[PDB]
Structure formats: structure tokens, C-alpha cells
């Protein structure tokens, strides 16, 4: 079934991630990829009282996502094209005990949030469920499209902020490379807080690798 | 006041190396 502010901020030096699975040590490496530009314009979204931001947001071949939580309001995302059962789309959620990823022709809820994401799923081409499991926290993600794959990075740090997104930096680590084979041009956030969306650009960066091969 | 060298020895896959001089620093010091 289905039941139915764009504040701008600064990206600081966030949105950095490990571009490849190659080990390096004590060196400066210059490259170019879809990274979040420094001090870019980041769009904030909120879930406060009666107002819940869950619009369809353009993907533009890759986005930056972050969220500040104290109650795990944000559960997941939907990525796809027409965002309906006309074609393929992928639902990526924290299902409260497992992470569940499915790519199907989903009959999505217009105002998703009991798991109220879709009523039906047809022509499923991909399914995955992670191992079982059971503001204060900043969660960071990077989503990129490459050769039919959705590349996902993840990171985390402790926070103490009310509305803003604290300045600093963090290198994210890869978590998924999903062989979805689907057209992602748009996406929506799945809510049960505040979150932020930026956009990635093919920008040249010089990365400083420390002794243990980490980026500092 | 890269390439193959030896002090134990080591080599690189780039085919490059540097050879030692006939006269070492101590020999030069002796002349001076």
C-alpha cells in the first residue's frame, strides 16, 4: 500500500574516497575522478515535525550523500529512471535486521516510508541481502555509475551538531559494486533528522598517502 | 648535498642503474 528547504551549505573538504583497490605507501598521487569539489554548494534536507523532505533528486552520473542522525530516520534510497514499474530501479535499504538490495520493476509508493516502499515488484533482475544485525552520528556515502555498476562508498564519524554539516574531511571506503545493469538518472531518499546532497565532478586531486597507505 | 644500485643490492624493473666511480670519497679526501 501507499500513504500520501534546500538550504545551501559548504562541502568543506568532504567527499574524498579511495579511487582504487591499489595499495600505496608514503607518496603523493595525482589523479582525476568523480569527487566532490572542495567548498562546493551542498543542499540540505530536513525531517522536522510535519515537514519531511523526500523529493526525487537528479543523479547526474554520481552524487554525494551525507546524513546526521540520532534516531536513524534515513533508511535507504531508490535509484532509477522512471521511478515506477515501467522499468528497472533499485531499492537499497537498511531493513532493520539486514541490508536489502533489490532491482525490479517496482510499483513504488509516491510517499514511501511496516515497510512501505512499493506495492509490487516485477521482472526482478538483482537481489541481495546482507548479514543479520541488531545529532550523534554522521553517515557518509558516495554513489557512482560505472559500466552498469553502482559503486557505493561508505564512511562514519561521531558528531555534535544540530542543523549544520561540520567542516572537515574524511576518506570513505568502498562497500558495494552492484551489477545492476539499470538506468539511474534520478533517486529518492527513504525515510522512516537531516541530510545533505552534493554532486560529483571529474576533478583533479592530489592525494597524500601515509605510511599505512591511508589518505591523510 | 628509481634505478638499480648497491650499498646489499637492489634492482628495478625499468632497466636503469647507476655505476660507482673509480675514486671513492675517501680517496678524494686523501688527495685534498
Amino acid at each position: 500500500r501507499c500513504t500520501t528547504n534546500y538550504t545551501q551549505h559548504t562541502s568543506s573538504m568532504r567527499g574524498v574516497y579511495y579511487p582504487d583497490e591499489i595499495f600505496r605507501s608514503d607518496t603523493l598521487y595525482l589523479t582525476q575522478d568523480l569527487f566532490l569539489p572542495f567548498y562546493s554548494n551542498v543542499t540540505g534536507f530536513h525531517t522536522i515535525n510535519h515537514t519531511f523532505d523526500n523529493p526525487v533528486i537528479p543523479f547526474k552520473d554520481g552524487i554525494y550523500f551525507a546524513a546526521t542522525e540520532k534516531s536513524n530516520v534515513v533508511r535507504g534510497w531508490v535509484f532509477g529512471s522512471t521511478m515506477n514499474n515501467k522499468s528497472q530501479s533499485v531499492i537499497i535499504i537498511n531493513n532493520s535486521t539486514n541490508v536489502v538490495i533489490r532491482a525490479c520493476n517496482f510499483e513504488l509508493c509516491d510517499n514511501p516510508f511496516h515497510t512501505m516502499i512499493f506495492d509490487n515488484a516485477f521482472n526482478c533482475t538483482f537481489e541481495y541481502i546482507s548479514d543479520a544485525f541488531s545529532f550523534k552520528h554522521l553517515r557518509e556515502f558516495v554513489f557512482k555509475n560505472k559500466d552498469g555498476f553502482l559503486y557505493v562508498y561508505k564512511g562514519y564519524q561521531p558528531i555534535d551538531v544540530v542543523r549544520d554539516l561540520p567542516s572537515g574531511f574524511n576518506t570513505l571506503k568502498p562497500i558495494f559494486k552492484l551489477p545492476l545493469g539499470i538506468n539511474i538518472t534520478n533517486f529518492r531518499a527513504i525515510l522512516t533528522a537531516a541530510y545533505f546532497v552534493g554532486y560529483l565532478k571529474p576533478t583533479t586531486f592530489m592525494l597524500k598517502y601515509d605510511e599505512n597507505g591511508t589518505i591523510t | 648535498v628509481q634505478y638499480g644500485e648497491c650499498l646489499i643490492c637492489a634492482q628495478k624493473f625499468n632497466g636503469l642503474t647507476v655505476l660507482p666511480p673509480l675514486l671513492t670519497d675517501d680517496m678524494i679526501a686523501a688527495y685534498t
Binding site: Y18, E21, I22, F23, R24, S25, T27, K173, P174, E211, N212, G213, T214 | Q2, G4, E5, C6, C9, Q11, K12, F13, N14, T17, L19
Partner: protein
């Protein structure tokens, strides 16, 4: 096949091939790193796909070889110099051609 270490071998890892000498290493690989590289664009080390052990890859000894002679009008004799090589390996590879 089993790992053959501390000698020049022809290796084939799942995604990395070539020749050289395999030795154990302590390179601090991340949970999402399969192999590493040197400062220059060459493979440094690989994590073994079966055991998850990490070994460095060294080049097989090579270099210039020169001959030292008196004139041929004086005598017929020669000494051979192998640039940049430990005589222990030179000798070994002569007996074990």
C-alpha cells in the same frame, strides 16, 4: 599450485602475471586492496587469493657483463665482471645453469 618462494619463478595470480621473486611482506593493505604498486607504475606486492598472505615481487637479477683482457697479441686470457650482482647468485646459477 603451491607458492614457490625466494627464487625466480613464473607466476600467475588471479589477475597478475609475470616473472620474479616472491617474498613475504608486512605491507599494511586495506580490507579492500588486492595488490599494491611502487612509487613508479610497477606492481609492488600481491595478496594471495587463496591464503590472503601478502608477498612482494622482486625483479630477477640482471645487468651488464664485461670482460677484462690483456691484448690478444700478448696473451689469451679473460676475467668476467657481472655488474651489480651478489657472487653467491652468480656462482649458484653457473653450477645450476
Amino acid at each position: 599450485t603451491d607458492l614457490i618462494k625466494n627464487q625466480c619463478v613464473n607466476f600467475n595470480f588471479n589477475g597478475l602475471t609475470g616473472t620474479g621473486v616472491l617474498t613475504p611482506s608486512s605491507k599494511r593493505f586495506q580490507p579492500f586492496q588486492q595488490f599494491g604498486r611502487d612509487v613508479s607504475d610497477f606492481t609492488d606486492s600481491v595478496r594471495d587469493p587463496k591464503t590472503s598472505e601478502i608477498l612482494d615481487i622482486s625483479p630477477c637479477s640482471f645487468g651488464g657483463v664485461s670482460v677484462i683482457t690483456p691484448g690478444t697479441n700478448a696473451s689469451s686470457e679473460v676475467a668476467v665482471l657481472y655488474q651489480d650482482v651478489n657472487c653467491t647468485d652468480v656462482s649458484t646459477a653457473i653450477h645450476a645453469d
